[PDB]
């Protein structure tokens, strides 16, 4: 029943896939400019003087900080769902096994 | 000005401090780049109008 | 192209027109040396908690 | 992803340890029921 149905264990695969997607999104956001002349911090520092570079950098900091905060919030919500599942599994172990 | 000239600068080393630190100029206004950092940069070409 | 990291010989099969490679993070992870024209890999220096 | 400051931490219990717990539960049930 299991071996002939590649998607039989989708419930566990879905969890793995969701976590992988969250990390890939967090990384890709580093490519965004967020209004800055460049997403590459080193290029900004190499081309612009301090009083101008700082203006461009603050734009990247705001964007990247917001992206990281979004990631963590989503992880807290997802963690709650997993905890509920684990609590159910623990109950079944005690009462069924 | 209606018939402005253009020259292309290539295959050479550009020490920009010779122009930047010159007192012969009334203005030296740079956009997108800080003039004091030009000596640390490389470009494919430079065009002089 | 400034930065900090460890440089080693690359195993990346660059074509003659390619000067560098990029990752999904929008960073350079390989360059062609301007004098020897060999390809070098770029990795970050070790770190951790 | 480590190069972007992202790290993955190991579980406290290994796959072998989890398998051992499962085996103990099976052996218990088969030989002694629910006692």
Swiss-Prot record, chain C:
Source superkingdom: Viruses
Impact reported for residue 2 to K: In strain: Omicron/BA.1
Assembly and oligomerization: Binds to host ACE2. RBD also interacts with the N-linked glycan on 'Asn-90' of ACE2. Cleavage of S generates a polybasic C-terminal sequence on S1 that binds to host Neuropilin-1 (NRP1) and Neuropilin-2 (NRP2) receptors. Interacts with host integrin alpha-5/beta-1 (ITGA5:ITGB1) and with ACE2 in complex with integrin alpha-5/beta-1 (ITGA5:ITGB1). May interact via cytoplasmic c-terminus with M protein. May interact (via N-terminus) with host bilirubin and biliverdin, thereby preventing antibody binding to the SARS-CoV-2 spike NTD via an allosteric mechanism.
Purpose: Attaches the virion to the cell membrane by interacting with host receptor, initiating the infection. The major receptor is host ACE2. When S2/S2' has been cleaved, binding to the receptor triggers direct fusion at the cell membrane. When S2/S2' has not been cleaved, binding to the receptor results in internalization of the virus by endocytosis using host TFRC and GRM2 and leading to fusion of the virion membrane with the host endosomal membrane. Alternatively, may use NRP1/NRP2 and integrin as entry receptors.
Protein name, as recorded: Spike protein S1
Gene: S
Range of the intact protein held here: 546 to 594 of 1273
Curated annotation (Swiss-Prot), chain D:
Domain of life, source organism: Viruses
Function: Subunit of the fusion protein that is processed upon entry into the host cell. Mediates fusion of the virion and cellular membranes by functioning as a class I viral fusion protein. Contains a viral fusion peptide that is unmasked after S2 cleavage. This cleavage can occur at the cell membrane by host TMPRSS2 or during endocytosis by host CSTL. In either case, this triggers an extensive and irreversible conformational change that leads to fusion of the viral envelope with the cellular cytoplasmic membrane, releasing viral genomic RNA into the host cell cytoplasm.
Name assigned to this protein: Spike protein S2'
Higher taxonomy: Viruses, Riboviria, Orthornavirae, Pisuviricota, Pisoniviricetes
Gene that produces this protein: S
Shown residues in whole-protein numbering: 853 to 887 of 1273
